[model samples]
Target: DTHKSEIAHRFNDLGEKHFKGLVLVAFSQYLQQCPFEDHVKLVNEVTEFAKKCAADESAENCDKSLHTLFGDKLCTVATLRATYGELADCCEKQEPERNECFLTHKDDHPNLPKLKPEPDAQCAAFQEDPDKFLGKYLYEVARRHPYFYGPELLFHAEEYKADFTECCPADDKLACLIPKLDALKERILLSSAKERLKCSSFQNFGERAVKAWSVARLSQKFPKADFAEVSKIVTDLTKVHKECCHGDLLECADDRADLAKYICEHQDSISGKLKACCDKPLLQKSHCIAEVKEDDLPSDLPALAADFAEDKEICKHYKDAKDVFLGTFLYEYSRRHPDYSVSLLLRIAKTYEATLEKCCAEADPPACYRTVFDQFTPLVEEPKSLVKKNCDLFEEVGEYDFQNALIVRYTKKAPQVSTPTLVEIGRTLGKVGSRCCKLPESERLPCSENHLALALNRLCVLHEKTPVSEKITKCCTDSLAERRPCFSALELDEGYVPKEFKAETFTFHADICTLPEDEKQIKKQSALAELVKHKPKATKEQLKTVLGNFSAFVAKCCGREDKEACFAEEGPKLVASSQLALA
Candidate 1:
């Protein structure tokens, strides 16, 4: 009874059509008396028979047999096989061939529906019904022949509601739908010289034809809906052209200022339309503004002038000189700082206006303005103390520190050094610091600290000595070891040491060097304060271990005179030790 039930379930699972085949008979025989291996062989035979029946033209009547054997549920297998086979053949054809076949013979294949156009008479019925025309015929047409109908609908879609298709997927369907329509519209408009001439015609026959077609489709859908503002603007421009050109299109070609003037006069309305128009797809927005000239658009300065034109004194002076003042200011400031943002430019312009009022009223305008502009130096320089602060944190300091130190000190004291020059100096120090930091851990300390000590010594004597000659002689004469300690002491005496540099001796040391024992402890305490901020729950023991590990790492890896090679050998171990201690 168990075996019989299993056989019945397996045969029913095979579906009605497959049950009629010889493979099912074999499967039934295997269930009755054959071994499990025979059952496997029989299943394989059933699959092979199904494959043969799928490809066999004689198997057409097999679906009826399947229906008779297993009823509706299993019957679909035969229908599916036949449908898939036809679909495979359909898919194998080229796109054009597939379209042709589908359109021409879709009646013969009842499963495949043809994408057909509505009759011309049906279109006329909705001629008076705009909404029904769009919703019923136009949308249906787009749904069927989306590539052909999408562009024709987009202008209406945009004018009515901006987010109509915003959620549409970018792949397959409506995303391709609108873009295709847009391209088709352009192609229809600019397909040939005759079409081009029609568009450029005095009466706007081409544009009107497009508008009429769109209206004809959309009118019944939105009967009382006004045409897009851009369409009306184009119409007005056409009228202006006819009037200004006196019906001679060629005459307006050389002198379109009348058209430009007309556009400029309606700038606010045109800009409003443009804002909406530009919100459409790129190609569609481009097509919207294709006919417009640069000068016909609104000006940024006009808006800016209105902003400042409120003050009576400012308006009185700047109203006439607005363009001149704004142009000269932007030109000079942008030439100096090409990356200046509009806000920065406006900010400086305000300063210029104030300066002009205070210093140049009743004076020679251009000369006084130029003098004031020259004196107007932007505080664009980065704070030098920030760089010094960063440099002071380096355990294995180098020439990079001294270099940054000099930049910070000199730029702060000597305001005459142009901001650009100071910026370049700061940039160079940043690059050197980056390079020094990237060195192998073992090399980093020695290279950075030793070079830093040497640079500091040289800078100290050079800046401190009365005569430049004596300073150069004193700083450059001694060996690095001899000179480094001498300048280190000199630096302390002259107050040349950076505020961050707490060492008793100016020279940097990995261990057993210049700084006082108490000073080292103070430095350690300061370092601990910084660490505690980041790791607030850290114990004093953990903090001490970190500092001790850091000191030992720097001392062991960075102490050698050939800091580069020394760091290369010992940097990794020291770095690992430091990280482990911190962890």
Candidate 2:
């Protein structure tokens, strides 16, 4: 049943006319094997179903009629078939000539450049019909790279749209287009590397390895969905890619298109970014959704862990499928520790694989594998400590004060990071602090890391394009766990212009001493942050002196009977003291 389902998926990848092509390929192979009378009957049934299905590609009865005719495996030689919806073209050919074309048509892609559109007219045609342009572009890519699976072709189609979207705007449109073409070629090569890896897994490590990979790859990418439902989609897609990787490119694309249509129908399964593509017309939607950026992990989502160390019979499962078991480890761990960098998570998976190899050979496999997990826990701890330390401060000071601290510390650390961006970051971190820190310690670690990771990821994007842009973008590319530390560790550029020393912005009113303790503390922190924001480059000792100046004024002024007179005089002195730090 598994093998037939696998075979059925290969033909189904051929597009809606899949069954007709299969019927022809299988028909030619088995026609003589059956009695002449049965052959004649097969002919009548096929012609009727083909014509009926050809009239309406999505007719409901086509699929059942197809399976009812072939029972899925009658077309055992489907790998020999052409994948394009050209069932009429090849099947209509005479005798063994028809069989020969079906056998060799996948290779005919090399001859398609004759039919492919010229580059000069592509922009003209693109405006009127990107649907045709993208496919023709895929065909352009096809002759040279025959091994490209259907989903990969669709991925390239997005590249075409993305390129032309930029391309048409330039004064020299053709000039702009060449670089895009070059970039597209590079992407094609990059995908080829992945294809080789995938095929290797399927060929050597087995199908479950690829299935486990699908789950791992898509797990955090589309994390809003639950794992079981996500796995079901993976099961179907795994089946398609497993078979399609070995077959015709166009067939693979046709198969991928079918899957795209299904994904569009099930847009609820994917992230919001993908839905924009699904909302597109069917022609573009399938190709459009093929390339998407992974969604950010939701900050509040809980970690999901299934440590392989807990598996008692680790060797028993490892032998089932080497890559699958490892892929399973990654999927379970990555989703559980969604805040963990993929680079680190991958290292853990690789290390676990080597550990399994050694332990599985030993009689005491479980004992060996359990120890492997123990040694690895601390590698994870290092990445998380900075995040936890920041949250610990947040938890220590509580939300309002934590935010004030962020405002001051960040302003001091990256003085070049704009004031607006700093306060915004402080505010967001404050809100996240409230949200995550309120959870018990058991839950707080991921909450602390997840939201902080997300905020750090956006630092470069929200920050304005000063030199701060250059610095922030570079550090942003650093691994998620290190980004906070990376930003904190930045040295100010020597070229920075010294600030014009002026009185700091500080307002002292009677309310400062008389307000409730919470309000008084909030006022004090606000003034402290403002002082830091103005004299951002001031030494730690200088800022501390300025903070003490403000505190002493408040402490003494509030106790006096002549509070108004005291504040009136002390306020300027406090501002001037903070102002001195700016020098």
Candidate 3:
């Protein structure tokens, strides 16, 4: 009776329209009546019916009708429970301990709130192999939720970093951290109200957001300060800011440059905050120090004179005073001497760094150091030189101690070092970190800022050379690509291109190496232009002949004299192919 009814329903007026619904109903009925051992065959029968419905137009209508009927609650409660039960059964029976369902759905539902307390443990189990499982999960979820949920999930998942076994040995931990960091960044961005804020993916999430937010907040205080406009001032110098100035000095400049410009621009409004007190001794000292030029000093004088003879306290004060003077002097001096080499200037900077350290070490109030660094900065265009000169003084007396104090103090805004100078100081700290790595841990704990600066200076010098090496390759390539005739004078021989020129051309050449072994298979494309009404045209074969001739001349010019006999044997064949055959 059931089979007869099923057949009768299929042949009815709405047969095709409700075919899927009827079949689903019939299958459920069959499963209820059939033995449990026949489940696989019953499942296959349903799958085959579904596939047929997918292929047939009438059956396609059945699909649409079913979905329309269900309203995406695609099946009856019993059916839905049965389907999910099968999946749950398979997971439980096959991988009892593992959380397969969570892994499979984590990315698809990353934003689904972890309403339960055990999600951390569950998600951790799901992400057992992060580089394989968790990395993909995060990447997919981030792409799906490009703006919002990605960042938070990525940050939360970063505990995998501590579980080293989750990552592949060949993978770079820092490089692997990038995606998680990126996701964390995206989350913060989506959460942040400020749209104009910029952040970097290269840095860790917490660091990047905090730094970016800090920068944004600081930038708001100076409405008219154009970063681009300030950046343009660097063109007046031969090098990038970091190359010319060490970390310690650069740090201070980066921190305070805009504020200084802002104060100078809005002197009236900021007068109270800046509190401009006219100390004749300070001004006179600044001018007196201003007379001496940094470049005029030799490399040997320890940035601080080794001997503070006769009176030690006055010697400390004298050194501090001289350091302030030197900083002021270098600030003015470098503006007048842009042509001076950075390395040469850095050598002289030792004196200023030594003096700043003495101020921090000996003075009762720390403002002594800040006064020397800040007041002296503006008298010249090269504030880096002034700050560095002061940093150099600090570098001389207990380098590590002074730098750490400066870093902590600057962060607290106690003795306000300028932004650029703070950045420079940071570079000095980076070098201290580098030295700390190189020395035994016990010895490394407190590195001298002066030694760190010197070490960093050397590393920076080496780093600066990198661009020049790249330039050497770049200039060589650029010179060739233009087919610039100016290259002929450079000993490239009459017909052959130089090796450098050849290498440059090969990099971007579409046709040169892509051609098949058979020469005639190659096709040459022409440059497009609004050409003259009249033009000459040639066939592919004719063009090939010309190219062959050109290549022969090049080979003849470049072939080694020791291999002259070999070239001579090949010469006739080249000539034959190259000869223009008009007929």
TM-score of 3: 0.17
Candidate 1 per-residue C-alpha lDDT over 1-583 given as tens digits, one digit per residue, 9 for 90 to 100: 1112322332443343333232322222112222333334444554544445554525543333321222122222323334434433444455445433322322111222433323343334434553434333223322222112122233333432232223232334344345544444334322221112222232223343333222222222221223353345445445433422121111222123333444345545444334444455532543454322222222332332323333335434565787454544443343233232222334455566666676446554444444554433542221123323544544344543343343443343322323334333443444446555566543343333433442333233323332333433464454332343343333212222222322231222354334666445434433443343334334445655665665664465455676556545664554444434543
lDDT of 1 at 426: 42
Q: All candidates' lDDT scores?
A: 0.37, 0.58, 0.31
Which candidate would rank higher by TM-score, 2 or 3? 2
Which tens-of-lDDT digit does each residue in 67-172 have in candidate 2? Answer: 3334322333233234334433655565345544443433311323233224567777888887555544544454344444545555566767888777765646
Better of 1 and 3 by TM-score: 1
The prediction achieving the highest lDDT against the true structure is 2
Error of 2 at 372 (Å): 3.2
Q: TM-score of every model?
A: 0.19, 0.40, 0.17
Model 3: worst 10 consecutive residues (lDDT sum): 526-535
- Model 3 global lDDT (CA atoms, 0 to 1): 0.31
Ranking, TM-score, top scorer first: 2, 1, 3
Whole-structure CA lDDT of model 2: 0.58
Q: Which stretches of candidate 3 lie over 4 Å from their true place?
A: 1-325, 341-343, 351-583
Per-residue lDDT of model 3, residues 30-98, tens digit only: 122223223334334544554455445354334332222222221223343444444333233222222
Order of quality (lDDT): 2, 1, 3
Predicted structure with the largest TM-score when compared to the true one: 2
